[PDB]
Every structure is written in C-alpha cells, then in structure tokens.
PDB file of C-alpha atoms and ligand atoms in Angstrom:
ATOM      1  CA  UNK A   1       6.925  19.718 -15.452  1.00 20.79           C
ATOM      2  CA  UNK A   2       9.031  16.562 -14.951  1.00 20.51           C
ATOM      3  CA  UNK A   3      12.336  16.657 -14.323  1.00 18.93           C
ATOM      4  CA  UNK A   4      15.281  16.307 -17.136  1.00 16.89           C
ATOM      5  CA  UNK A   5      16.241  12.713 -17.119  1.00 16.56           C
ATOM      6  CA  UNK A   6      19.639  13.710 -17.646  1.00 17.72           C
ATOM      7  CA  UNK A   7      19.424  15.138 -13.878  1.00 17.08           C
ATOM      8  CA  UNK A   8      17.538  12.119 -12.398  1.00 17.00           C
ATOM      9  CA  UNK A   9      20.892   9.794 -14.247  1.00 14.66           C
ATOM     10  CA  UNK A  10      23.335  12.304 -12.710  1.00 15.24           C
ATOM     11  CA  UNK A  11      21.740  11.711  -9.356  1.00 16.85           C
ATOM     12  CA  UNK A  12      21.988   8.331  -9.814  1.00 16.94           C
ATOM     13  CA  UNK A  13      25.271   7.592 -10.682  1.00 18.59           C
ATOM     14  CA  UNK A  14      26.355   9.952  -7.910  1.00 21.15           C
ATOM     15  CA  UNK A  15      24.329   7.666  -5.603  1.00 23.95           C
ATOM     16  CA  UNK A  16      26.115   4.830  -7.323  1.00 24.63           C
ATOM     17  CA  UNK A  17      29.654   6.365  -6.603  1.00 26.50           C
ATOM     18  CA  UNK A  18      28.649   6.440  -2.800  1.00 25.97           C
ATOM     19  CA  UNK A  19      27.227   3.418  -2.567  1.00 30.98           C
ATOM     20  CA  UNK A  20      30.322   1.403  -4.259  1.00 34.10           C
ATOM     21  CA  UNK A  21      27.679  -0.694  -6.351  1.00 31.09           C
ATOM     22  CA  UNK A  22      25.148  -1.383  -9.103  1.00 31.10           C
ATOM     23  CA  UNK A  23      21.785   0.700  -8.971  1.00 32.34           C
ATOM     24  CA  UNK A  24      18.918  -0.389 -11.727  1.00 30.40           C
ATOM     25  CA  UNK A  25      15.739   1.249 -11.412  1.00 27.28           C
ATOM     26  CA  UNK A  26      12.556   1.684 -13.387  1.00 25.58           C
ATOM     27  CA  UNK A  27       9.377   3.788 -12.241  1.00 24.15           C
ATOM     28  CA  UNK A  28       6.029   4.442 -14.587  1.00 22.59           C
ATOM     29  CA  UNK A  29       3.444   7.026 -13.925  1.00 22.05           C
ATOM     30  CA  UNK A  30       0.146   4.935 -14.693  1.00 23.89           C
ATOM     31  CA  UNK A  31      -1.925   8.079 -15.555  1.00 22.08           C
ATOM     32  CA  UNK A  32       0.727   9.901 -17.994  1.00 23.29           C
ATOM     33  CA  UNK A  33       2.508   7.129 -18.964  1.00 22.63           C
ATOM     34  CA  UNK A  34       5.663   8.277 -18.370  1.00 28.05           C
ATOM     35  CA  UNK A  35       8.390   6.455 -17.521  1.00 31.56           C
ATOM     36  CA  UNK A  36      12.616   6.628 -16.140  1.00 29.81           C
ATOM     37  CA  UNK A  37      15.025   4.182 -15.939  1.00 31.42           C
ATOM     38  CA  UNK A  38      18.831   3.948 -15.163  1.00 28.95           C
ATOM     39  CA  UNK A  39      20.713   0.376 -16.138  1.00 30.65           C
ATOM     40  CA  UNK A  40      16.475  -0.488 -16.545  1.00 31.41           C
ATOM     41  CA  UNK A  41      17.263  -3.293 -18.848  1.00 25.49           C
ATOM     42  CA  UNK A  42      20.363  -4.649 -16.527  1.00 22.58           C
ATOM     43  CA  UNK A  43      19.930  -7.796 -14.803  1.00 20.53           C
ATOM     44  CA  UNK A  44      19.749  -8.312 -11.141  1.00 21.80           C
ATOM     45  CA  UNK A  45      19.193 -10.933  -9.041  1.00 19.66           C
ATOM     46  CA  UNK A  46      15.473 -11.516  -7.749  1.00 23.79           C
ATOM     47  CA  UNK A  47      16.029 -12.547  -4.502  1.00 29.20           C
ATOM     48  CA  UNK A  48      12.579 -13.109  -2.549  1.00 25.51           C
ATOM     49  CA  UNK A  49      11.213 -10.524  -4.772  1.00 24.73           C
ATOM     50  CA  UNK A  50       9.858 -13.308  -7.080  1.00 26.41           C
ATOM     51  CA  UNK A  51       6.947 -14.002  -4.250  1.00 28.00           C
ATOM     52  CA  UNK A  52       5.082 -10.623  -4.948  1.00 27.06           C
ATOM     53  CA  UNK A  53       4.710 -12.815  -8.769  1.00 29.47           C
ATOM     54  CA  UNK A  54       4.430 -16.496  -6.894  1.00 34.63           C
ATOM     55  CA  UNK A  55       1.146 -14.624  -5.437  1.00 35.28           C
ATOM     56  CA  UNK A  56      -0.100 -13.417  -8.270  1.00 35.05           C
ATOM     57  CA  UNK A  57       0.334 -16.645 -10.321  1.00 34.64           C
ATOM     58  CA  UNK A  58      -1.342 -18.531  -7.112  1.00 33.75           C
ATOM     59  CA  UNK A  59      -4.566 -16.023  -7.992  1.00 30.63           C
ATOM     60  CA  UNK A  60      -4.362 -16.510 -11.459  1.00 29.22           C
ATOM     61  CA  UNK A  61      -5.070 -20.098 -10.782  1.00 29.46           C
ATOM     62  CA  UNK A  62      -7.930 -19.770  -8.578  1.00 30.13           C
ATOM     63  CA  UNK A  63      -9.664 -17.927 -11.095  1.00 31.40           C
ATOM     64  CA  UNK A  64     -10.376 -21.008 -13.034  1.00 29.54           C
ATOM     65  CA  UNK A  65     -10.164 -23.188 -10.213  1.00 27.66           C
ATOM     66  CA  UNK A  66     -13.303 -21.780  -7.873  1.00 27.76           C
ATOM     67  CA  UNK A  67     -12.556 -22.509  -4.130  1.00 25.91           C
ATOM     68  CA  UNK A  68      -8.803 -22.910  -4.432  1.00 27.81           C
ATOM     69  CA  UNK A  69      -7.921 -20.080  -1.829  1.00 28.85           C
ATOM     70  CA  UNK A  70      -9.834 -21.999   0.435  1.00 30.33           C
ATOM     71  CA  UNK A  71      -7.899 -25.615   0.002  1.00 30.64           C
ATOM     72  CA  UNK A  72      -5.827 -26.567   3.050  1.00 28.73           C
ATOM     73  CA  UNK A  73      -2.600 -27.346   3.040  1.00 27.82           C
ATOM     74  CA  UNK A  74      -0.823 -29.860   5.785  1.00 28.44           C
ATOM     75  CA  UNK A  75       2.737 -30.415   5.720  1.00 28.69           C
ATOM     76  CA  UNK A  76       3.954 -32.511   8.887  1.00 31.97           C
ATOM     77  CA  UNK A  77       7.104 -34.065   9.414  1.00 35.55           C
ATOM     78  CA  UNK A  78       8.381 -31.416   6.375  1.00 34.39           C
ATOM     79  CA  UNK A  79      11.888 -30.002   6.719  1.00 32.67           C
ATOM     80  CA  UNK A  80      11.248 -26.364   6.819  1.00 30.29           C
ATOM     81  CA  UNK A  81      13.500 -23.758   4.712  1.00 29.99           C
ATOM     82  CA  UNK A  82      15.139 -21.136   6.763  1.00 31.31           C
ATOM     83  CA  UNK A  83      13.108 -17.791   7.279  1.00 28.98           C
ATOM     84  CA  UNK A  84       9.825 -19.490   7.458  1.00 27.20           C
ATOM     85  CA  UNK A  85       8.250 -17.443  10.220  1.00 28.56           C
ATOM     86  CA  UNK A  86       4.807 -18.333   9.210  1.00 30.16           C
ATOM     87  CA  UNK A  87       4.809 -21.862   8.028  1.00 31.22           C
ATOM     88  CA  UNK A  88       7.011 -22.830  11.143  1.00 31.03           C
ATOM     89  CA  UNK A  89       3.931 -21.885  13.207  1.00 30.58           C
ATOM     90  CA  UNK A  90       1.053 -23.548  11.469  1.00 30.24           C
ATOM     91  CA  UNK A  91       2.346 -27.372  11.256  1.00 30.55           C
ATOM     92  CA  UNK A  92      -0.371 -28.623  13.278  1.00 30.86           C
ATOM     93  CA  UNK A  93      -3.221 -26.527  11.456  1.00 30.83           C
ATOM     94  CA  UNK A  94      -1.786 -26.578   8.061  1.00 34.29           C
ATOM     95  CA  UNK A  95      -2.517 -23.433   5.936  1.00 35.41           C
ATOM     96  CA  UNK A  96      -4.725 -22.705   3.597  1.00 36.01           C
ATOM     97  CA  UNK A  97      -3.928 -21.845  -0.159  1.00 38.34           C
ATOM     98  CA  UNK A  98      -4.710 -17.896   0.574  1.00 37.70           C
ATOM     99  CA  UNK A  99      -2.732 -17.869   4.073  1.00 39.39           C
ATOM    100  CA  UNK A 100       0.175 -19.434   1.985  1.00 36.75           C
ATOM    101  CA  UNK A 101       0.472 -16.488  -0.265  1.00 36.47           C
ATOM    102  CA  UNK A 102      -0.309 -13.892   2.019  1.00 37.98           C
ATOM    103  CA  UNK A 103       2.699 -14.853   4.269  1.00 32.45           C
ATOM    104  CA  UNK A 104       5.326 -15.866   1.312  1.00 33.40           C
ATOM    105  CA  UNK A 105       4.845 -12.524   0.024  1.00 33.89           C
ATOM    106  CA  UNK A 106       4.180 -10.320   3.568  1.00 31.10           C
ATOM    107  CA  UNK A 107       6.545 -12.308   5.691  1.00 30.12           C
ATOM    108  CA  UNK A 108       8.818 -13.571   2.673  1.00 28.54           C
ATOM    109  CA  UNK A 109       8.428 -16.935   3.887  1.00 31.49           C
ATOM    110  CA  UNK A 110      10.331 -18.954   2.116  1.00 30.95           C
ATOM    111  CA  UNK A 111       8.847 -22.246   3.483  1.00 31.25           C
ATOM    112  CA  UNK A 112       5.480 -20.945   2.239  1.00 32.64           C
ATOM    113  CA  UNK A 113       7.100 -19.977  -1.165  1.00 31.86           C
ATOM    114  CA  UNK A 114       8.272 -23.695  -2.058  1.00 35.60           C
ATOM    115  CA  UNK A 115       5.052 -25.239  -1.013  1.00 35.07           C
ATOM    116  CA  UNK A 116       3.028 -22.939  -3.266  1.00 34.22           C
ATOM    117  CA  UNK A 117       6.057 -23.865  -5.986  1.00 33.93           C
ATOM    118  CA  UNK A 118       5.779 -27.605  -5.163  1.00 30.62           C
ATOM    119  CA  UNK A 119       1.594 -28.260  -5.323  1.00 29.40           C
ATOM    120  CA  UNK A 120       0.644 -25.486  -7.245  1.00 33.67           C
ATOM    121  CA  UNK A 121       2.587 -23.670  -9.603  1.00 30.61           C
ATOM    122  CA  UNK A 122       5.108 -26.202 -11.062  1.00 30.12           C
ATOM    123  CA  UNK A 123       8.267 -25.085  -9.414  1.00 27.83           C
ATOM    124  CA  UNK A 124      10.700 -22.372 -11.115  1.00 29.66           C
ATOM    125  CA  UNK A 125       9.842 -23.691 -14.526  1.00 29.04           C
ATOM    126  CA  UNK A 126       5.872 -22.825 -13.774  1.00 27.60           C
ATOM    127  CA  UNK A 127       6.648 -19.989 -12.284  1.00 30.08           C
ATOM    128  CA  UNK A 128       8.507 -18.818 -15.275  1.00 31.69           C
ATOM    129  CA  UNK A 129       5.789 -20.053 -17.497  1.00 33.67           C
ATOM    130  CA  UNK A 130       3.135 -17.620 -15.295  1.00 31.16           C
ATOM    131  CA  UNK A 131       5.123 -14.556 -16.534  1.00 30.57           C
ATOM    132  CA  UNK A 132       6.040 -15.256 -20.325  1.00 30.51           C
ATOM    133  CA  UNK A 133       1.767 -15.772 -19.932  1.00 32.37           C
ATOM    134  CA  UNK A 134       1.519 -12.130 -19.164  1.00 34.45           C
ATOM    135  CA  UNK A 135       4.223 -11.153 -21.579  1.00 34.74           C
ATOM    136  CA  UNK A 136       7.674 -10.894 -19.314  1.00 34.57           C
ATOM    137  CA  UNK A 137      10.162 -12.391 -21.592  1.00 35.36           C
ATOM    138  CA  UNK A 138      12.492 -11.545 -19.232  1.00 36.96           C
ATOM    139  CA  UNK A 139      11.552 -12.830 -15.856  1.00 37.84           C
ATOM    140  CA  UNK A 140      13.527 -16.175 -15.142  1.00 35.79           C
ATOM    141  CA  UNK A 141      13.141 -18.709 -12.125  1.00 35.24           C
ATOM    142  CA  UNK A 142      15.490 -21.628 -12.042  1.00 34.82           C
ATOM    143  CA  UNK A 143      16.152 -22.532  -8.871  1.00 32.40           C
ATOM    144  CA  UNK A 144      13.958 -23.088  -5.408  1.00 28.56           C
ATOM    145  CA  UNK A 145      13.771 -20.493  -2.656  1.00 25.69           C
ATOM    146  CA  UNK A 146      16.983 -20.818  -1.217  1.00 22.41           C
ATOM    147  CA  UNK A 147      18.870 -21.867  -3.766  1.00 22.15           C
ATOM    148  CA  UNK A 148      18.070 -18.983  -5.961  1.00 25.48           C
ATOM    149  CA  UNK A 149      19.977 -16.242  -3.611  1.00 24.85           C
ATOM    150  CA  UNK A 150      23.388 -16.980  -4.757  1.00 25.36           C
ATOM    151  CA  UNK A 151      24.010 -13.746  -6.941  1.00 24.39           C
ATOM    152  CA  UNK A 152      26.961 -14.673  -8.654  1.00 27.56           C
ATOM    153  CA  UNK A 153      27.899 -11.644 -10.971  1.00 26.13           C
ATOM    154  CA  UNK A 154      27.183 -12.827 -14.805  1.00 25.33           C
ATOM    155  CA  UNK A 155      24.709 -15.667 -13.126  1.00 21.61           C
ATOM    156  CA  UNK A 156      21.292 -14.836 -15.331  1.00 21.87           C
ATOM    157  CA  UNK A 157      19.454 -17.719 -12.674  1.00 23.83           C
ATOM    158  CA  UNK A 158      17.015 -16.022 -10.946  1.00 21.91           C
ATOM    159  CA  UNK A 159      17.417 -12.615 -12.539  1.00 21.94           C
ATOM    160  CA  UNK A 160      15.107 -10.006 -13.937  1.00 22.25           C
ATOM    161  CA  UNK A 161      15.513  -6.364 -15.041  1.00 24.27           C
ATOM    162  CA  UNK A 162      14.143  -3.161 -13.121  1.00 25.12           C
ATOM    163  CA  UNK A 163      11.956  -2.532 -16.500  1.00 25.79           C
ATOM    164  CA  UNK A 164      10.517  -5.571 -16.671  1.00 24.72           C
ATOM    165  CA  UNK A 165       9.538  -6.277 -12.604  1.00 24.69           C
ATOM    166  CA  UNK A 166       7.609  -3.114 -13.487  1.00 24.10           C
ATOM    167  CA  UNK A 167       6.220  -3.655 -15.891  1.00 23.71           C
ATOM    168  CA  UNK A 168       4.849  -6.740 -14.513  1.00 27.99           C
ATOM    169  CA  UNK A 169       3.824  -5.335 -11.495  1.00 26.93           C
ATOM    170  CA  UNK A 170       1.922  -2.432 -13.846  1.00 27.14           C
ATOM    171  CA  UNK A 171      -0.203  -5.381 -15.287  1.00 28.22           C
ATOM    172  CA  UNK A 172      -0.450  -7.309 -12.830  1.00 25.50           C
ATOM    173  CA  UNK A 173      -2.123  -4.569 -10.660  1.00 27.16           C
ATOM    174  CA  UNK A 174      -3.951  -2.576 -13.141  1.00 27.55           C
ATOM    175  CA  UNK A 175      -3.997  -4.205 -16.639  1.00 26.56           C
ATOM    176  CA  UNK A 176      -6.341  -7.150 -17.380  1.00 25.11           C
ATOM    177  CA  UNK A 177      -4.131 -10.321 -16.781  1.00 26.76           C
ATOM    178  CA  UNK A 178      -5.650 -10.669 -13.510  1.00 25.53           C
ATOM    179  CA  UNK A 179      -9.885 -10.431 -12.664  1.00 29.64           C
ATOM    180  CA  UNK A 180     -11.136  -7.169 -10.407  1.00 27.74           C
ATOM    181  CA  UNK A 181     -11.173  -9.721  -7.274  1.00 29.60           C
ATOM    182  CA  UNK A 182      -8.037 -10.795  -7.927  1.00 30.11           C
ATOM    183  CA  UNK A 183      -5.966  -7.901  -8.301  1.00 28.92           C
ATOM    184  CA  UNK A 184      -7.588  -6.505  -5.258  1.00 28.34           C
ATOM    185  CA  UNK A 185      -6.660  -9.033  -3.128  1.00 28.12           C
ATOM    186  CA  UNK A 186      -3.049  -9.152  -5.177  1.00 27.01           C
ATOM    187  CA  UNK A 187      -3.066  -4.962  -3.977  1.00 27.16           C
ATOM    188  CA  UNK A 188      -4.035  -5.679  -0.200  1.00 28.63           C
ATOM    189  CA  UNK A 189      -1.618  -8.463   0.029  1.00 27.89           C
ATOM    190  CA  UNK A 190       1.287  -6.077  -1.572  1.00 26.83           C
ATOM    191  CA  UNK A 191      -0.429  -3.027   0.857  1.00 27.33           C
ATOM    192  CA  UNK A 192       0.184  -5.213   3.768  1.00 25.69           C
ATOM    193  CA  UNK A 193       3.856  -6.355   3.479  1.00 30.33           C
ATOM    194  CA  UNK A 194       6.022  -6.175   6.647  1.00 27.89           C
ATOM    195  CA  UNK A 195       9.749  -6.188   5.333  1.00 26.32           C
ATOM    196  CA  UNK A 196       9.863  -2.901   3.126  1.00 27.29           C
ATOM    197  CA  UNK A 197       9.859  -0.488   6.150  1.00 30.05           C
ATOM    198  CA  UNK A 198      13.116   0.664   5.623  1.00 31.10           C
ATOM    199  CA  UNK A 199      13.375   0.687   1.594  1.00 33.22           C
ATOM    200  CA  UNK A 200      10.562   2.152  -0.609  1.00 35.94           C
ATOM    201  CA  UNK A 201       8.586   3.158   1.898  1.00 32.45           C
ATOM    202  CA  UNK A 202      11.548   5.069   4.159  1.00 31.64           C
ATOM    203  CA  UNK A 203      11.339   7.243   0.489  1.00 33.06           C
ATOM    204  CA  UNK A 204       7.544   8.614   0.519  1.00 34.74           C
ATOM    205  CA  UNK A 205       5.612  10.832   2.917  1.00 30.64           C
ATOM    206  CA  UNK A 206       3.879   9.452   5.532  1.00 29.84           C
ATOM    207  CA  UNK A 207       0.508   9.614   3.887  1.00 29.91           C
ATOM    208  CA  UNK A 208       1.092   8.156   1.090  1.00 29.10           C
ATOM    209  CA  UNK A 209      -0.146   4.120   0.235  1.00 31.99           C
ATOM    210  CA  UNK A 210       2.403   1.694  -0.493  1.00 27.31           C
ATOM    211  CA  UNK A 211       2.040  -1.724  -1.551  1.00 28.98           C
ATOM    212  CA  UNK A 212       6.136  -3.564  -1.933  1.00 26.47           C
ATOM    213  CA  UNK A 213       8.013  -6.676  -1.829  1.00 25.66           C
ATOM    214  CA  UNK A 214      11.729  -6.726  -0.996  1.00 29.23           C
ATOM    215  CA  UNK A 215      14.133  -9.463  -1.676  1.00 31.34           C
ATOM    216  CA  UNK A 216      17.873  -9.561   0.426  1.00 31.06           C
ATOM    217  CA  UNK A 217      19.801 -12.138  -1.156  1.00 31.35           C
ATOM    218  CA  UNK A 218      22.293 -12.057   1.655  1.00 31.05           C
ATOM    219  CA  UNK A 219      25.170 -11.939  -0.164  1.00 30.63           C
ATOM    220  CA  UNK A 220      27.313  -9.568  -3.025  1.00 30.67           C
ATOM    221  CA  UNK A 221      25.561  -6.638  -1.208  1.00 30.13           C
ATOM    222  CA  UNK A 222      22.689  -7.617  -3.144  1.00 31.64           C
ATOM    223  CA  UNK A 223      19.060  -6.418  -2.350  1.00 34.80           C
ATOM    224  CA  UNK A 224      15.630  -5.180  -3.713  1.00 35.16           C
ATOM    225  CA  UNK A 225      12.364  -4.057  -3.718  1.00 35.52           C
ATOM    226  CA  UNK A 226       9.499  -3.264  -6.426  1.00 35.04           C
ATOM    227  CA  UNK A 227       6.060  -1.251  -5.239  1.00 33.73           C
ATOM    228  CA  UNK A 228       2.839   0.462  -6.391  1.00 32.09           C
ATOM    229  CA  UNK A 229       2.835   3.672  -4.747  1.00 34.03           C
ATOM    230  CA  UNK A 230      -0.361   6.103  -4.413  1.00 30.71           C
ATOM    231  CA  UNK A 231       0.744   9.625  -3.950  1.00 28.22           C
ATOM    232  CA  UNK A 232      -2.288  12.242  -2.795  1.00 27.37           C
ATOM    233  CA  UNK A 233      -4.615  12.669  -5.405  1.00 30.74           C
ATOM    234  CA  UNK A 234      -2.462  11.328  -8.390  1.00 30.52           C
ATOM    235  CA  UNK A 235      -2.070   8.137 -10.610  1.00 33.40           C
ATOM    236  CA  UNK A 236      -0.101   5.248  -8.959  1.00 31.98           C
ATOM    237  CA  UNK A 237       3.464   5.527  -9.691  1.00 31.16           C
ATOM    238  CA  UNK A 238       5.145   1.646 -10.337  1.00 33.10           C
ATOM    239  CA  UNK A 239       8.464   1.220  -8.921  1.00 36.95           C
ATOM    240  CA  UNK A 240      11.725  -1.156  -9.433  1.00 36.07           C
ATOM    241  CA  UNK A 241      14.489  -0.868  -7.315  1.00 36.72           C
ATOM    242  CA  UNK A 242      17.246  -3.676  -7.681  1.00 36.68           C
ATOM    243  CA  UNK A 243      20.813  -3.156  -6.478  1.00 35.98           C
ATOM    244  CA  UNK A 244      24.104  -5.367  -6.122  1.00 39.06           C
ATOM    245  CA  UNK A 245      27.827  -4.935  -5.371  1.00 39.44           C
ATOM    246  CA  UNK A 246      31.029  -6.481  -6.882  1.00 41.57           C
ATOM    247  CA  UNK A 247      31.962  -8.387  -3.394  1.00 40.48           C
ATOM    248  CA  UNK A 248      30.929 -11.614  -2.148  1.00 40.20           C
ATOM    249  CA  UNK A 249      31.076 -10.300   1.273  1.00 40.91           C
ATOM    250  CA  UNK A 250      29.654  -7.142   0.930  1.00 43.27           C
ATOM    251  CA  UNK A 251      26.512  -5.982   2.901  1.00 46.15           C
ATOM    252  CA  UNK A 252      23.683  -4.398   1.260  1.00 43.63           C
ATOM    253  CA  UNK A 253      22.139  -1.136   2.096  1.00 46.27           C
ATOM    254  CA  UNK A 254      18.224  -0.257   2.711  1.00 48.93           C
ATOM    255  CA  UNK A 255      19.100   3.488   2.534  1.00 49.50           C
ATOM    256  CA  UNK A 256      20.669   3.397  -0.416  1.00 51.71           C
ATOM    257  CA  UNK A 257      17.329   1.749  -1.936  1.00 50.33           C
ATOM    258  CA  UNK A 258      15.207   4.572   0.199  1.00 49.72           C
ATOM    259  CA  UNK A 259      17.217   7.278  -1.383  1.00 48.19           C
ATOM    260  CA  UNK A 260      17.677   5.673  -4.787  1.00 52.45           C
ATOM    261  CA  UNK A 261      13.633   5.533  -4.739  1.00 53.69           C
ATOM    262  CA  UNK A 262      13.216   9.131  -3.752  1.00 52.69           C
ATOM    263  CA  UNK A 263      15.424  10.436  -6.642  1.00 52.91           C
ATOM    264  CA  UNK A 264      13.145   8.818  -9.153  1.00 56.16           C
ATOM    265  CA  UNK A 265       9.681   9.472  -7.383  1.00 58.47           C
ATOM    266  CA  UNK A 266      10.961  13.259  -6.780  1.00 59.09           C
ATOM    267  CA  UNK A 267      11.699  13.052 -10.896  1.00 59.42           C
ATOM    268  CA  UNK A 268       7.975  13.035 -11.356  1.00 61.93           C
ATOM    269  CA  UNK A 269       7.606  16.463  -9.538  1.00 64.40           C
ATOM    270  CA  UNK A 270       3.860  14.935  -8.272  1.00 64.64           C
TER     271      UNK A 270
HETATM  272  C1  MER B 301      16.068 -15.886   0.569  1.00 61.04           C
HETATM  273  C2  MER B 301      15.135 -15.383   1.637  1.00 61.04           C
HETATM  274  O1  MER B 301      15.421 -16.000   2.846  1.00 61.04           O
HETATM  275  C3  MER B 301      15.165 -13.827   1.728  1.00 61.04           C
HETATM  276  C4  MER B 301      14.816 -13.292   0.325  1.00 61.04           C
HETATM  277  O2  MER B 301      15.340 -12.444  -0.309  1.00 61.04           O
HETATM  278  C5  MER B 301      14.179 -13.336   2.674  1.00 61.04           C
HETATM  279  N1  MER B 301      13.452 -12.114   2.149  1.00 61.04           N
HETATM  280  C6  MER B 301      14.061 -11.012   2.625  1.00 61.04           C
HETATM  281  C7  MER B 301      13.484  -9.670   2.275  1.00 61.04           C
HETATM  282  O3  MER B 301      14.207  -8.641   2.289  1.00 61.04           O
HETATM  283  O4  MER B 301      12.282  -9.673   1.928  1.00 61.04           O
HETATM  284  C8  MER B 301      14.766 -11.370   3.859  1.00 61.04           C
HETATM  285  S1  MER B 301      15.727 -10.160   4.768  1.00 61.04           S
HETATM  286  C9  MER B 301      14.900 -10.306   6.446  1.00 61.04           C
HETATM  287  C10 MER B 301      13.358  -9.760   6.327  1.00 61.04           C
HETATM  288  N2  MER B 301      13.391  -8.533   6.826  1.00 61.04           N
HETATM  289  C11 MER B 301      14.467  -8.541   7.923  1.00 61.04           C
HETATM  290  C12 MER B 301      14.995  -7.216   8.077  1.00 61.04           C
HETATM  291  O5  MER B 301      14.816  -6.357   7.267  1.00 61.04           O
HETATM  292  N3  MER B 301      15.771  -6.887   9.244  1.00 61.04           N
HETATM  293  C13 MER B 301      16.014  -7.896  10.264  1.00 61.04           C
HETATM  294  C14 MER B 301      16.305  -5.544   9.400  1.00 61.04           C
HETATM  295  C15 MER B 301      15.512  -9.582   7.382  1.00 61.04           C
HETATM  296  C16 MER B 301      14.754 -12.745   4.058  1.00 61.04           C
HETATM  297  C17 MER B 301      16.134 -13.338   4.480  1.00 61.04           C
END
C-alpha cells in the first residue's frame, strides 16, 4: 500500500530543483521494515547533529560506570564556545554529567558538547570509536564542536550519510546497543529537543510524538535533522534528513527539510 519509490524520487528531485541544492534522506518503518532513500549513501556534513550520538555514547558509559549521570562537572574560568546557552548559565553550579547531555543535545550546546568530548568520551576520535562499536562504519568525527561546521564540498570531516544516521538512530533507540534505562532516557532526551520546531516536526500532524536533533552548520546552505517519529497507532518511523548547497554564502532552508520529510513520511501511506 506504499507508495512507488519511483514517485517518492520524482518528488524529490523536484524539491531539489526548487530548492537549488543537495537533498539526502533515509526513513525506516521499524514494524515492516521497510525502508526509502534518495542520495541515502551521499555524504553530508553533521553539523550539531553528532550530539543526538555524543548522548548516547555518554549513556553507554554510565552503564558500566554506575553513578556517572550523577558526577558534577565545574568548569570556571573556561572560555566558552559560542551557542552555549546552557553551560553559560551554570558556571557557578557546574553541571552534572546527565544535565550536560540533556542540554548539548536539547539546546545544541556546543559548550556542553566539548566538555562531554573532553572528560568523557575521548574527543572526535572517541566519539568515532562509540559508533564503529555499534556498527556505523560510516559515521566520522574529526574535529571539535565548532570546528567541525565548515562544510567544504568534497570535505568527508565531520560527515555521515542519511542511511547510516538512521540506522544508528534505529539501534540506538530500539535495538540492543543500549540497556532499557538507557534508551529511555536517550528517547525522552530526543522527545524533548527545542531546535527542530520548524524541520521534522513542521512535517507531522500535531498529534503525533517526535523525538529530533538538528544541526545548522551556518554556512554552504547546509542543515539537518534526524528523528524517531510515532505516528497514531503504528511502528515508529526513523528519519534522516541532511541537505547542503553549492555556495559558501548560501542560507539554508527549514521548509525545505519540513517538506522534504513529509514526502517520505507520506511514502509510507500510515
Ligand atoms: C555549530 C553549532 O553552533 C550549531 C550546530 O549545528 C548549533 N546547532 C544548531 C541546530 O540547528 O541545532 C544551531 S542553529 C540555532 C538553534 N536554533 C536556532 C533557530 O532555529 N532559530 C534562531 C530560528 C538557531 C546552532 C548554531
């Protein structure tokens, strides 16, 4: 009862057309196992998108490390990163380990992002070495948070594909990489993200659940977002959106993600 995937491409590339850019997208219905994609093995930069994974490698941890959510984490006299709403607020009560990765991935916090990277993971190299651990071969971190937003065209740094950030996401959520407490707080963490209002979300009814993280690399109209999406009464449906444009100075466009997302979701016919 799906729809032809020759259609859901045609859309696509129409989108494309308009948009004067690069679409890659990959979806997968966890109950049928179906899947789309359109350039789904193309590379893209990550952006910010790479906290939704910083999180989950941060859990990953504390399951062999009992209390680590709890630790406390003080950072005076640090220079903080640009777009560091969080952190900038809590020099004076430091954070703890779970308030870290709730705001690096809700708030895209990049100050948050590099402390978890510096004391816990082992920078983009550990981060990297989190996701070949679950099986993304792909999935590459190189740089630190701001560093990595460059999106120079033919720059694999800090690049994934559509399929695999799904993928990913798909195990990371459901499979068995992560322990029942952990992938519920991964979920609530994801459910509770404040930047994605205008992407993934502006695709699905009202009533639906959404759990997303964006990344907006600033530059080379470049800009993302992945998601676990509940429709009424149906499977999740896992969803990579990653876009980019052949001009340095080009802006990026939430719509285009929105509308990009609502071809493939509509593809399903849920
Ligand atoms: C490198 C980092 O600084 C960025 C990562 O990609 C941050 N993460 C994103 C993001 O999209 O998640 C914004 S865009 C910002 C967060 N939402 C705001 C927004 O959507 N507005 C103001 C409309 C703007 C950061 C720069």
């Amino acid at each position: 009862a799906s729809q032809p995937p020759q259609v859901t491409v045609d859309k696509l590339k129409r989108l494309e057309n308009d948009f004067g850019g690069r679409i890659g997208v990959y979806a997968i219905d966890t109950g049928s196992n179906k899947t789309f994609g359109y350039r789904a093995n193309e590379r893209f930069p990550l952006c910010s998108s790479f906290k939704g994974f910083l999180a989950a490698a941060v859990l990953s941890k504390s399951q062999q490390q009992e209390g680590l959510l709890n630790q406390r984490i003080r950072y005076d006299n640090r220079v903080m990163e640009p777009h560091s709403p969080v952190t900038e607020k809590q020099i004076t009560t430091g954070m703890t380990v779970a308030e870290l990765s709730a705001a690096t991935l809700q708030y895209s916090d990049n100050g948050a992002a590099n402390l978890l990277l510096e004391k816990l993971i082992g920078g983009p190299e550990g981060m990297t070495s989190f996701m070949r651990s679950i099986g993304d071969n792909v999935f590459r971190l190189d740089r630190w948070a701001l560093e990595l937003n460059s999106a120079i065209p033919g720059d694999d740094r800090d690049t994934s594909t559509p399929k695999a950030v799904a993928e990913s996401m798909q195990k990371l959520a459901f499979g068995n990489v992560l322990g029942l407490t952990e992938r519920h707080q991964l979920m609530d963490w994801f459910k509770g993200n404040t930047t994605g209002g205008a992407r993934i979300r502006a695709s699905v009814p009202a009533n639906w659940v959404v759990g997303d993280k964006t990344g907006t690399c600033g530059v080379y109209g470049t800009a993302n977002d992945y998601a676990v999406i509940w429709p009424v009464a149906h499977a999740p449906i896992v969803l990579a959106v990653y876009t980019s444009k052949p001009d340095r100075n080009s802006k990026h466009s939430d719509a285009v993600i929105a509308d990009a997302s609502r071809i493939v979701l509509e593809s399903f016919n849920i």
